[PDB]
């Protein structure tokens, strides 16, 4: 699988549980939220591609998804109880824990760098032709 493909299921399933109607609408989206979380935990983030399995950040990645399944684990057994309130009210910390693993400025100053080299080479070539061409 892929990290951000699991966040393609984890983002849109996170915003549906907040104001939802019945207890299965909590419970079906929580089964999407748990099962994509363990598959992302096996993965590797792309900015830490070249390291070891036993790196200090990669454990700090891999215990950093134990917190998120553990903060899935708060709203699991309340969702057996039929509480429409206590499921979504305990699940408000999921957006804070997406913020703590956002793991990107040094790559994006190649992308804005490369498009100007294919913009200024248009202007520098067509500008000289824009001067000299009616005398010749």
């Amino acid at each position: 699988a892929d990290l951000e493909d699991n966040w393609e299921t984890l983002n849109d399933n996170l915003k549906v549980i907040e104001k939802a109607d019945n207890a299965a609408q909590v419970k079906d989206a929580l089964t999407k939220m748990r099962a994509a979380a363990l598959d992302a935990q096996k993965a590797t983030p792309p900015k830490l591609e070249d390291k070891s399995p036993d790196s200090p950040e990669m454990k700090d990645f891999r215990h950093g998804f134990d917190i998120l399944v553990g903060q899935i684990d708060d709203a699991l057994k309340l969702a057996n109880e039929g509480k429409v309130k206590e499921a979504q009210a305990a699940a408000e910390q999921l957006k804070t824990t997406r913020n703590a693993y956002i793991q990107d400025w040094k790559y994006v100053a190649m992308v804005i760098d490369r498009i100007f080299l294919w913009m200024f080479i248009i202007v520098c070539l067509l500008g000289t032709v824009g001067l000299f061409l009616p005398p010749w």
Partner: antibody
Framework: SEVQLVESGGGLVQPGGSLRLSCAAS????????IHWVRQAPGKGLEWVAY????????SYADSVKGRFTISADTSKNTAYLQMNSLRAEDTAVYYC?????????????????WGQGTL | DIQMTQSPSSLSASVGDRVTITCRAS??????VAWYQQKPGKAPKLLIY???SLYSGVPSRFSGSRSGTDFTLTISSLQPEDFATYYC??????????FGQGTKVEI
């Protein structure tokens, strides 16, 4: 040195009635382990009944047994007590008690593996 | 729920031969498949936990394989001491645990 789990209490329920099942877990603790209960209707595959999480007392019943089943446990002598009210003959099954470890860790990935001798 | 489609329910194949057992889950389970050998009437035993890994005390002629939704128990040298009612089983969350219907080889 081994973890062992002993299933007992098997017999007849009078029709309409109730009965309590006992699982005695010898060798290990129950306060850091969820204990599940799983039956096998005969001539078939497998079909899960209910569970109890003894870290907080909490239990989950299936849609077969909601309203009719009630589990508790004693943490002193490592025992599980399952309460069966208003049964049927599709409950006439092989009953096993079961172990599961907790998140995080490799013992979460360790599934059901200590399966007992079974009661009818 | 998350149903579990066994294939096959029963089979009949030779001594020593390579036998495949496939199972397809009905929605996304990450890595949680456990496979079980079920002998006639005794205590059941676990062969495969985490969908491809051997149990600590199971022979290494058996193995498992996940590939997305496909979960497959492979038997290389199926000995005469090995016939059963086999089980794929999910273990995602404690209240939604479903089994397989079983795979019944006899020797």
């Amino acid at each position: 040195s081994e973890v062992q789990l002993v299933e007992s209490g098997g017999g007849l329920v009078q029709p309409g009635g109730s009965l309590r099942l006992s699982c005695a877990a010898s060798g290990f603790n129950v306060r850091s382990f969820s204990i599940h209960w799983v039956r096998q209707a005969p001539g078939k595959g497998l079909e899960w009944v209910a569970y109890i999480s003894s870290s907080s007392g909490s239990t989950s019943y299936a849609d077969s047994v909601k309203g009719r089943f009630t589990i508790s446990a004693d943490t002193s002598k490592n025992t599980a007590y399952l309460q069966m009210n208003s049964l049927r003959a599709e409950d006439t099954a092989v009953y096993y008690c079961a172990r599961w470890g907790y998140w995080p860790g490799e013992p979460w990935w360790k599934a059901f593996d200590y399966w007992g001798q079974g009661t009818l | 729920d998350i149903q579990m489609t066994q294939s096959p329910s029963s089979l009949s194949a030779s001594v020593g031969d390579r036998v495949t057992i496939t199972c397809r889950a009905s929605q996304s389970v990450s890595s949680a498949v456990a496979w079980y050998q079920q002998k006639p009437g005794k205590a059941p035993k676990l062969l495969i936990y985490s969908a491809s890994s051997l149990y600590s005390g199971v022979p290494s002629r058996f193995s498992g394989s996940r590939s997305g939704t496909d979960f497959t128990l492979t038997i290389s040298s199926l000995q005469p001491e090995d016939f059963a009612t086999y089980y794929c089983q999910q273990y995602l969350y404690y209240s939604l645990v479903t089994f397989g219907q079983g795979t019944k080889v006899e020797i």
